[PDB]
Amino acid sequence: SNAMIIGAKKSKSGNALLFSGPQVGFVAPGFLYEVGLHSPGFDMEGSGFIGYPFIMFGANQHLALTATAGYGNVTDIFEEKLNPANSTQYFYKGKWRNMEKRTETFIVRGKSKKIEETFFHTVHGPVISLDAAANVAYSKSWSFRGTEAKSIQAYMKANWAKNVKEFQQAASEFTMSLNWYYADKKGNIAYYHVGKYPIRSNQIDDRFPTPGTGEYEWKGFQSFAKNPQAINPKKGYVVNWNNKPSKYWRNGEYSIVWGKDNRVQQFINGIEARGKVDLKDLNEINYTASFAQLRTHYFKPLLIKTLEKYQSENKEYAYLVEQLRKWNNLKEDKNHDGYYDAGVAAFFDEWWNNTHDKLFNDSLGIVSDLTREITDHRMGATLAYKVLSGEPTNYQWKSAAAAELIILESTDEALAKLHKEKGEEADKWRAPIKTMTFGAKSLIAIPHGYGSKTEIIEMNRGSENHYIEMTPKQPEGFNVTPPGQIGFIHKDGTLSEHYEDQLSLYANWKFKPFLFDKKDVKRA
Template structure:
């Protein structure tokens, strides 16, 4: 078998000697990295523990990741095949014509030449990670093809296709397509422009801008921060101007506005504004995206340092919220050898372990929400729509042609265009406009993967921070170590924009709003051993002096669900590991909205008689612990206040915003975000954009965002609070009767869907799993406890380690064996040392990396 040399300092073969000879020439590093070498056969040992988790032992990087890929193929072959195809836009060739539009969408969103160029430029040891992983996958695939009736997963038989061989490109694209093109790619600048245009059309420029700034503020200084105020003195954003009056540069009609967002494949879609919203909503639904308008709301973290930990030096508990799927979104693994000695889990079995630990440090991550993507409005040449105006000249767009193979039908071709700013996301030839996406992380995707992989080899904060500085995606990184030190870094490559560039709206592509550069990592918010003694994050604002993301559905505001965590952490002087687990369980059932609004309702009803139904309703809310359970498991939430509050908040949002936000845009701000049995939880519950704006409106002059437009339209806030409370009471009583003892909503189950995060089927329709009650918690949870000498780790990765179902329908014993653990908020142990692994090993496999 051919693969890449590990380290030229330790030659084992004539291939390595050739490497040394070539090193003395003027060949570039990239050429050396691509030189295949013939090496002696390696040995890999895979020990699977009592939960089916593989621990891979090998001497070289290639062999270690060969064992990793081999193990993944055994457990998740169909899931990984679908992940590979869904991130590259290759679904139609195995599932048919119904997936052609999906494939087009995906292929227009990445540049395969750039990814391959980055892979080719890797050094030999990094390249061995990808090559070894692919080789291990292929080794198991060969065995499944030889024994299809016993080893080929049932889903391949059901859908009548076979797995194909993997390459280094495929391994990298799993990461790029599911992490970069998801978490690093959120952008609603075109939708923001649509909203602003509609507001100005309805209210005039002054009030239109005022409403826009209150709904989608640049900065809310009252928003809670991950880094305690005063602990970080850096300056991330150099500009401190309030952008309120720049004339919008936009289309003039609703039809033109609609076209801006939905054009595909270089064409123009003639949709009305309402049609455009319906179209986008359908796309979000079909592709499995979640949250408001299809966007996910993701991940929490608590890290406790020596100052606040009891019975331990440091404690880390991560809850990444990707959504819930079967097979599980994350995959557990232990890697031992070639400079690695770690255990943890990671999405889609990335080579990099996102949530894990070695004996010295633990690490984790949550989505950072920083703005790393801008949309540029390109002016097209009227005589040639494939040329765009830049710096006074029309320039040709780059073009590549992609062929989409279709099962049972003829292939189709699409042309994908790119400007100096990036790939086109929409085009309007009638208006001579196109929109291109510029990503600060473009060209750095593979380096980011390697940084995330190599952080597992760090044994101190300095080395860990060095890897964090290489990450180009907008991700929060967390650290804890044996000595009780804890740390945080807001990672990513962020553009230095010109002062006239409002990051919420598309920028001119003609050359006047080009980035000035990329900010140095030293300006990214970061802290080591914060004054609070802990680090809490639920995708909230990283630090003061930080502008908000450009997404209408996600802003950093005074109302933030991280407050549910901070309130518990600040109320107690010390925390044991059990306390931290309990805190995470408590916030998983907490209502994230109630804490902000019950005091306003209380104040509004203070003057009412004690027997007034509205005052009695508020007393019910005040007595509520602001959480929802079904302890008697009767299928209904125990708390009557849950029913009342979930009825009130939408009523108040409607009374406040419906007469101010025109048309379909009101729907963006109308939702309270609560799931229901008919619309189950697909990702975590978050405070919605309308709810955040409502709190600011109620705060009035005390709001963190200046309230220059009166959403109450001259009425008192108390009037709307009382009217909405009355309307909510009527609805509750009509449905449940007058007696609050009967005000019980049906429990929303936690469903593990059979589509992946892009909506592609990664399991059979009959494989949907669920627990009794939904919990606002991690897709997985992992707990790491350091005592100064040893490390103790626990995790739960539901439904189970393996997604394998045999052709006869028999599932792996580890197919869903963590489902009950997850439902009961329990954890399984994980093992790191050889002694621990050996004591809990159930099976051992020995492999040769050369057949």
Template sequence: MLRNQLQEDHLSMLIRALLIALLIPLAVGPADDGARVSLTYGGETITIVRDAYGVPHVSARTLAAAAFGNGYAIAEDRIGQMDLNRRAARGEMAELVGASAVAADRETRIDGYSEAERQAQFERLPADLRAIMQAYADGVNAYLKEAQASGKKRMVANYPGAADGLDLTTIQPWKVTDTVAIGQMMARRFGGGEGGELRNQLILTFLKNAHKGDAYKLFNDALWRNDPASPTTIPPGEDGRKWPGQPHWADPTGKVIASGGSPSLGSHLPGRGHGADVGPMNPIALARAADVADQKERLALAERMGLMTKWGSYCMAVAGSKSATGNALLVGGPQMGFRTPQIAHEVHLKTDDVNVIGMGFPGIPGVLIGHNAYLAWSTTTGVNDQTDIFVETLHPTNSRQYRFKGQWRTMDERTETIAVRGGEPVQVTCLRTVHGPVVQVDEKARKAYARMSSYWQKELDTFSAIAAMARARTVADFGKACSLIPTSHNWFCATQDGDIGFWFCGLTPLRAPGVDPRLPTPGEGDHEWRGFLPFAHMPSIVNPKQGFVANWNNKPAVWWDNGDTPAWGEVFHNGRIAQLLARKPRITPQDLRDIIVDIGTYDYNAHVLLPMLRSALVQRINLPDARLTGPARKAGDYLLHWDGHAKDGSVAKVIFDAWLNEVREDLFNKPFGFIKLQGQGMFSMAMQPSLIVHVLKDKRSSVPVQYDYLKGRHPNAVMLQALNRAVEKLTKERGADMALWRFSRGTINFSPLPPIPSTDRGTYIQIVECGKPNVRGVSILPPGQSERPDSPHFGDQRELAGWFFFKEMKADAGASVSSQ
């Protein structure tokens, strides 16, 4: 039976209209046949009510009591996933799945903390946060005890070895250090901040061997430091912060280059040859160390186990001055991949002083992305460079000693044991220097590679920040909460006062002179970090003149440099969001939903490169090597009429992708073809579309290249000849009938449930209007709240998501009740 769940008299006109248009056609909810759950903790009564989509609404007088209910409810929804999360975070997955997980567990142990350190970090938290985390653990255990007493197995999706049900007696009681471990893992994975110096050193080593004097030109082209044409969150000209002294950075040759006023992420001294010399390095050891630093085994295991492996996310905040209702609006779309069960969950916590609803992670109390009674917020990965690899010089005869400030120091060492299902336990030796965990020891070269991170031992500060966000009432309150974030994130808020704000967060190291931040740093003590950039100097803005801020992991401000990875270039997907938001003088919630749909299929490579190709097609310069074949001219007609969206059946999308690959091969295969040893995908990732733009724009490029890739050819000729080759290959692969070259965008899979069409969308999405007296929002969390295939909430949001429909975020705890 169709039911209107929206309580329309409490919703603003446009949020109500959005819900009616997007939700009601599919708003058939499960019957309200369950009972209200009442619990007792610390002398308080806690009430848990589930709405028609299974979202738990927890009411209590204090936050500690609400946290108990939070833990109880999410354990009911996700105890299997919580167990997998803590195993991954602790490096204990091999105990469950066997030898295939040993390498990942070893990485986790080497790069992580001991149990004593996790406990010590917990004890350093403020007393109120300790009480909340302990209450959450107690709530998980209260549910677990009840469930175990039933003696029944529980059906759980995609838990290893539990196809016929999970025996809950095998699940160990929850500890506060489980939450600590998961929080640390999520903070690092979602905002850990690079650490690719070893990968870059390996690339430079290959370039030196293959290209001699051109090696540094190629290196600097592929790993550019700043592209002023790259889309920014803060509008150009609206950020008054310039780093005092306008410091400089330099490439490995010692050539000093202006950094545009960026923080001293690495200011290279002139006349230093190749800069801070780390001595000869063994490529094989470098490759192994790079794999550990990049979390290769951990991410591969997480992918197999259905845990979070990806980072991304988009966010839009619209000020009241640009909103059609006069109320500030916010969209949050964290992108972490799609699994069954969902990576995140939803929860609503209501106490005497907090009323917060939104998305969280199983195993961690509270709401990470959502809204309270005064404002809404979201976050995206910041991609700031907060990690460096230091190269330690080992003692000639003792590999456990390294030289630091003129003395031989002994590494910290501990041994941990990995239990292996069906096999013998594995011993792991974990080493640390003053810089951090040792990811690889190169006995031959007498080097050790240590990973130094600015957030080391500080990850739990994020809990303090999230608690402060839940209590924030103004944009200023929220900014103060952001100052506590240690890892790299962009944070956004929109308030009932009509204000919006953006803060680029995370501890940014101030590196020593003589350091190129793209490469490993000498570890003997002369190139230590000089501290951290004060939060007041980090990019931020409140109420920009354009009336909105938007981010899709792009750079925060024009003057902010890339780190050790050239993530930010002229080709970047945020350009489309900003374009769409700027088109209308006033923005409605419906407009925001339409933008979410648009960017889901928009090809951001085409956003910059397609106009360049079209220009070449129209100009048709009179050069022998710029002539098109007949089929290529027909392909050009498809491209001239393409709207840039990767929709099912699009012929132009197939042609454009083939053309882009041909241009990449033409320009970069000879100098960088060695990267293909890591796979064609790695080559395509390294030779980014922005680098193609840098080359094809030639002298007009925002980042002029140093190496001669064109070899005397006109850029238009390169583009048109690539189109000839692309069409020739497509004809061989797909046949002569161009109309049959149809693009398929694939699906998002929720096994064992049916898939939905694939789009570049948020794992969770919320649209919130911050009106008075009520802040109201809608959200979607596919496939559903529960991990249990026998629950009505296992897949009840999957079909809604497929149509970009939403459900109400019920911020009043007296909502309808449904069973699990």
């Protein structure tokens, strides 16, 4: 998920701006639900996740809000020491303790079968895994265990808030790990990394499970005042694409998302390349991020630098350099011909895949079932970047000479395959676009409807977008919430006219007006 908030001094109009882009996948019926809520002193328009009694992406009379997933460290795994004589007992604070046991019955559609399973809890939480060979059970502690309803209440209070103080109070009560973003009609912006973050033992390495014997327990939760947060930061804006809140904020086992190479660079690049901005500028930045080949930011310069050293003797390398330099780093289809516009992007994709394999297969190949998702992560490839650029690493993966040989061998192999299958001219390399549908199964991993078969180009983009300007009169702007508002399909097969009537807007970078004033709502 991505977000941007723009303060008064960075906005062309002098009004604070907000952009939302939650990434919750693409399903029909959609993951979001758009609504307008109007009662005395409470007027709010926007969307929330399906089933939520509150808006997460939108604006009330006073403020606009959005959120992105925080990735903060709110889950710890405890390594319980089991009694060798009784595997339902674990050692805790000097004594064997009994696990709480629970029998659960599942009715399964075939007639129907009934199957029983037993689940266990310890003082730390549910037991998730056994290492019986080691006399260990692993239990899971969530910092927000039992406080999910307080998080709902905090979000409702954010809806009812009228100013920074009230919004911040709501933020301080939210217990799960999100980033919250705020913009108001007075020109203020604010950012909060919300959640209840535990005070951990300083004797353990928080990238690994914690021994469960009692010496290493959490000692409460830190004050909200210690959560990363800023009101009206000096830079005049905040952007986020699930990246790190601030320099010294840590997240334990999940640091793999917060490295030097990070996808938020697309938003930073776009905001820093401009002076004052408006909503149209924000949309251009979203477009770039949505179609960017993310490895280009750090890896295309490295590739060009290497090829340029050998272009005198290799004419193919000189051609590649020219094509790479003129490429705008996107995989886009502006002429809607079904092929990505830059043929060299197909070369670059295959170059990267070859380079990543050659960097790590000979060392991490044997653990790649666990490490490929780290070293080729969707948010960035920091370790690969450090190895190829010669920056300091703890292990000496490759010398600079060995890294350059990898870059060259990967180039040769990718070019040889394109020459064999397509030809020598880059226009012949242009790859067919990848498409996506709004299907029947969301991230919750169970079916919730029948989906849609309408194909649109894949985009690295929010499942909805709002663009909001907090004008003196009221929030104004535009948004899209695909596939459509209404999920109902009649018994006879007749589709609601609002089942997928926002797909064309989404696919074509068009939007519908943000409605707030009742006179506008009535004519909309």
